[PDB]
């Protein structure tokens, strides 16, 4: 959208952030009382790899290798633990101009045993104003 052009462009993408958690019937040697799996995915299995470079999951410092990196679908990390925490998620885009990444702070929370397992869903909408034509291609093949 330069002044002497008549068109402009706006494309919106939907991402789903979520996790599942259930009490391990059998604790771990270290005392991890739960098993949880957190993911970043696109609604109805539409391939977001067209425009996603990689997803980075920053785990609490109590995990070994807390910076978990997912360069290819599915974008998830399966772990075990004992308490709920905030997990920040970075999504890096196949784009040569900023916007390059977006961060979300995800609430990884665990239910007590004797309560149902957690399956939690967060849907997030992102809006790209006048993207480059090559990134607009990627965005709109998904």
């Amino acid at each position: 959208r330069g002044s002497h052009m008549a068109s402009s462009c706006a494309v919106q993408v939907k991402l789903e952030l979520g996790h599942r958690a259930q009490v391990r019937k059998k604790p771990t040697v270290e005392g991890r009382t739960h098993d949880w799996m957190v993911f970043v995915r696109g609604p109805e299995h539409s391939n977001i790899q067209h425009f996603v470079e990689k997803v980075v999951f920053h785990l609490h410092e109590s995990f070994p290798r807390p910076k978990r990196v997912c360069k290819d679908p599915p974008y998830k990390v399966e772990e075990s633990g004992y308490a709920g925490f905030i997990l920040p998620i970075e999504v890096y885009f196949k784009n040569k101009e900023e916007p390059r990444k977006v961060r979300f702070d995800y609430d990884l929370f665990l239910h007590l045993e004797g309560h149902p397992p957690v399956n939690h869903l967060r849907c997030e909408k992102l809006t790209f104003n006048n993207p480059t034509e090559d990134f607009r291609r990627k965005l709109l093949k998904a």
Partner: peptide, 8 residues
Amino acid sequence: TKQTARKS
């Protein structure tokens, strides 16, 4: 409440 302790 129904969820567990949280760490930080």
